[PDB]
């Protein structure tokens, strides 16, 4: 569930998180008993927000940004600590990304997209645009999102996922089609069938922009489209962004 009460987590949300733990973990009660109130827990360093020399090539900056996102850790607690309203003006979402870097808690895919925009607004030669995926596995549908990027005419991605190959892509793909097809193949290898892809517009580098992120400029039904039309729609989206 999503924490709605800000930080520090309020008592009711905090207790609800631990109730969830006790339900789904085999030991459950012993997990909480060993952690809650413990006086000798590891001190986790606040990860350093990466900053860049003007001489650092953008792709190397992107490695550092992704490393920062990874260091926060995938959120496995069951409680999302930051509420994200996707229609919020960019300036409000950037205040959120700033809070994420200050409080430094675990995150998942949507939070990492917001964070990835915030950490690349200093790179005007980089374009950023969200890519969402809907997949099917074992009778269920799953949703995922990453931050597509374009540098010097080549495509990559930043993000957070449980799988290495469903988040970070160095910007080396010659076309948007090839980037998305790489995600499709990565999904295939973990037995997910890709059903839909939704691609947004390029995001302003002004963190005080009042405009909204445009999340679903192109919505592609992979099965209905077939291979060639799928390719064609992706190249059209890439032109729409150019």
């Amino acid at each position: 569930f999503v924490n709605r009460g800000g930080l520090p987590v309020d008592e009711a949300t905090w207790e609800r998180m631990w109730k969830h733990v006790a339900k789904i973990h085999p030991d459950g009660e012993k997990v909480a008993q060993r952690i809650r109130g413990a006086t000798d827990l590891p001190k986790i360093p606040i990860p350093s927000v990466p900053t860049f020399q003007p001489s650092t090539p953008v792709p190397e900056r992107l490695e550092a940004v992704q490393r920062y996102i990874r260091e926060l850790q995938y959120n496995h607690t069951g409680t999302q600590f930051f509420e994200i309203k996707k229609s919020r003006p960019l300036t409000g979402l950037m205040d959120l990304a700033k809070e994420m870097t200050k409080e430094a808690l675990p995150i998942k895919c949507l939070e990492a997209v917001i964070l990835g925009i915030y950490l690349t607004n200093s790179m005007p030669t980089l374009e950023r645009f969200p890519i969402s995926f809907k997949t099917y596995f074992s009778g269920n549908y799953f949703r995922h999102i990453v931050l597509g990027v374009n540098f010097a005419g080549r495509y990559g991605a930043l993000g957070m996922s449980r799988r290495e190959d469903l988040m970070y892509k160095p910007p080396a793909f010659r076309t948007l089609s090839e980037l998305v097809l790489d995600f499709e193949a990565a999904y295939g290898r973990c037995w997910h069938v890709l059903k839909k892809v939704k691609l947004g517009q390029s995001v302003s580098h002004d963190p005080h922009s009042v405009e909204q992120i445009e999340w679903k400029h192109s919505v592609l039904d992979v099965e209905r489209l077939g291979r060639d039309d799928f390719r064609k729609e992706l190249e059209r989206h890439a032109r729409d962004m150019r």
Binding site: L7, H25, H76
Partner: peptide
């Protein structure tokens, strides 16, 4: 250090300790 900063500090330590355990469980 304020009471509110103390709470966030204590909570963050328990969140990461829990995340380690829940991370170990999800691959099982």
């Amino acid at each position: 250090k304020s009471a509110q900063q103390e709470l966030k500090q204590r909570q963050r330590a328990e969140i990461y300790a829990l995340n380690r355990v829940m991370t170990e469980l999800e691959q099982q």
